[PDB]
Amino acid sequence: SVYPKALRDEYIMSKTLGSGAGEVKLAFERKTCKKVAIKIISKNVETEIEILKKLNHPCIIKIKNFFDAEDYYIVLELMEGGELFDKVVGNKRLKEATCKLYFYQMLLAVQYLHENGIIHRDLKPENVLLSSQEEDCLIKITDFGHSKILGETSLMRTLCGTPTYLAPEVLVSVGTAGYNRAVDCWSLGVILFICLSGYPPFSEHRTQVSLKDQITSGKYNFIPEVWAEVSEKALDLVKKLLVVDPKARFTTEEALRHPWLQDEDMKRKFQDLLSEENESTALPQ
Amino acid sequence: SVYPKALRDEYIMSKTLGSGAGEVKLAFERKTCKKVAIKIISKNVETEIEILKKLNHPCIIKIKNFFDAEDYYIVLELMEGGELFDKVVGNKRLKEATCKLYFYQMLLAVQYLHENGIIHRDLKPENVLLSSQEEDCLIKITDFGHSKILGETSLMRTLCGTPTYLAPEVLVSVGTAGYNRAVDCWSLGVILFICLSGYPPFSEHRTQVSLKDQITSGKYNFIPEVWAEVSEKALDLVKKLLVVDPKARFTTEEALRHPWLQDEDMKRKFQDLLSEENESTALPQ
Ligand SMILES: C/C(=N\NC(=N)N)c1ccc(NC(=O)c2cc3cccc([N+](=O)[O-])c3[nH]2)cc1
Ligand SMILES: C/C(=N\NC(=N)N)c1ccc(NC(=O)c2cc3cccc([N+](=O)[O-])c3[nH]2)cc1
Ligand SMILES: [Mg+2]
Ligand SMILES: [Mg+2]
């Protein structure tokens, strides 16, 4: 095949940066001669695009352009650090400090999603991009292919009338409705676990308990020797996110107020990284 | 206000037949001089229309025309018998035979919906229309405003991968997923109860138990004197439909195989009514 003409008109395509199940290419925008990343999706991408066009957060990827052709082409800012996945694969592990910097940003991103009525639903190291190859860098969450937009539910509409003809299971669902965002907090819990320890909390490696039973019981694989070097505060947060009951699970707000994230140096590094990214116009006064 | 010009072009509007929360008018189609009903909905109606345009069953209302103007206008076949509601209101009750004829048709309709991946979600006497003012008549289910189209779920897509990062509540939901159609079977249960007895199974009339607790416990209001005259087979079916566990609840197939509906005279009256409705072209042989 060839790249679509409208893409070629605006961009020169270059080397592969990565591969999804999917592919990411380096490209140069002709107008500016600056590097961009182009995600190719083989044929609800257009509504993922609409979601991402309306979100404005430094820790969420921004769409620069979009082409709907033989395949989809999504142009975004280059994230030269690549995926978080590559930093944690093969039992590699990040310093606890670097974990905290990254995780803080993930929480800010996800908090902003949930405030804006969006649930991501596929948070994982593959979908966290690093702005640079330096350890202290900005991260951005990507891939909104599984995301969902919260709004008025069928349930809410049902509850407006009298339940003369309404099934008991609908009434029972009221106790737990409206906590779908908590699935993101679980995933974040799993991400943090992996970042701090270099291994997954739930996996079929050297165990006879099924992955499903591990997850539904909440019984993560704790190896103390790996964790000895990790703070108690870090592990405490992990434990409040990997809570099986979604109504009891920490929200992003609760996580951000956790002792582990009350870290003024970390928050300085983040603010410094932000201003560094920014290329501001002159301002009055 | 005035009726839209495109409606006026094709139809002469006449008297009110009824009122929703909503209104139904008598109209005459100019081309044929024949009577039609026009439902007015003050401003997902257009997709309700698309659902009803693709369904083809004698016990489901057919759309003849549609106008999307200041309000929505939906043209359909006249159902001169009106709503089932009016036959059961004020503790009026139908002969058990008439209940069976009507209910059989409701089951056929709902069975056809569920076969076609549609759940109605608002089955009630108000949404059952009678073709004539005779007791032995055809019925049609109407009002697909709350309906939902079944198809590949997010759940199914989630289960295709590995649940490394997946929340326990999603895995727990697998046990009960795919039974949303059972809400229609519950409602049918409530409709049948009302038809046979002339009173609602669950209501706040002369009780201290909340409507919600009545429904979730499945503890319907049984008044034996009202029921003495009703068969045991009729009440048995009622009980298999008003089953609180949606996985145990009778499906439309199970209901149709129930002893109460193994009634050859009833099924003859229905077939006779069908052929009577029909105005067939000549056929080879
Ligand atoms: C929106 C989206 N996917 N949406 C979807 N699959 N439905 C999406 C998914 C992944 C990305 N990934 C990248 O931009 C991305 C991956 C990568 C790896 C090494 C190096 C770079 N880089 O930019 O230098 C990379 N960028 C970008 C967008
Ligand atoms: C599709 C629909 N509603 N959809 C919605 N509200 N979202 C809908 C709702 C109700 C009806 N009702 C009738 O056609 C209808 C009600 C009625 C009462 C006395 C007499 C007649 N009649 O036709 O002689 C009646 N027809 C027809 C359509
Ligand atoms: Mg994905
Ligand atoms: Mg309705």
Swiss-Prot record, chains A, B:
The subcellular localization recorded is: Nucleus, PML body; Nucleus, Nucleoplasm
- Report domain Protein kinase positions: 11-261
Tell me the outcome of changing D122A.
Loss of kinase activity and of the ability to phosphorylate CDC25A
| Modification after translation, per record | Phosphorylated. Autophosphorylates at Thr-158 and Thr-162 in the T-loop/activation segment upon dimerization to become fully active and phosphorylate its substrates like for instance CDC25C. DNA damage-induced autophosphorylation at Ser-154 induces CUL1-mediated ubiquitination and regulates the pro-apoptotic function. Phosphorylation at Ser-231 also regulates ubiquitination. Phosphorylated by PLK4.
Catalytic activity of the protein: L-seryl-[protein] + ATP = O-phospho-L-seryl-[protein] + ADP + H(+); L-threonyl-[protein] + ATP = O-phospho-L-threonyl-[protein] + ADP + H(+)
How is this protein's activity controlled? Activation is modulated by several mediators including MDC1 and TP53BP1. Induces homodimerization with exchange of the T-loop/activation segment between protomers and transphosphorylation of the protomers. The autophosphorylated kinase dimer is fully active.
For this protein, the Enzyme Commission number is: 2.7.11.1
Tell me the outcome of changing E29K: In prostate cancer; germline mutation
What's this chain's function?
A: Serine/threonine-protein kinase which is required for checkpoint-mediated cell cycle arrest, activation of DNA repair and apoptosis in response to the presence of DNA double-strand breaks. May also negatively regulate cell cycle progression during unperturbed cell cycles. Following activation, phosphorylates numerous effectors preferentially at the consensus sequence [L-X-R-X-X-S/T]. Regulates cell cycle checkpoint arrest through phosphorylation of CDC25A, CDC25B and CDC25C, inhibiting their activity.
**Partners and quaternary state?**
Homodimer. Homodimerization is part of the activation process but the dimer may dissociate following activation. Interacts with PML. Interacts with TP53. Interacts with RB1; phosphorylates RB1. Interacts with BRCA1. Interacts with CDC25A; phosphorylates CDC25A and mediates its degradation in response to ionizing radiation. Interacts with CUL1; mediates CHEK2 ubiquitination and regulation.
The protein depicted here goes by the name Serine/threonine-protein kinase Chk2
Included range, full protein: 210 to 510 of 543
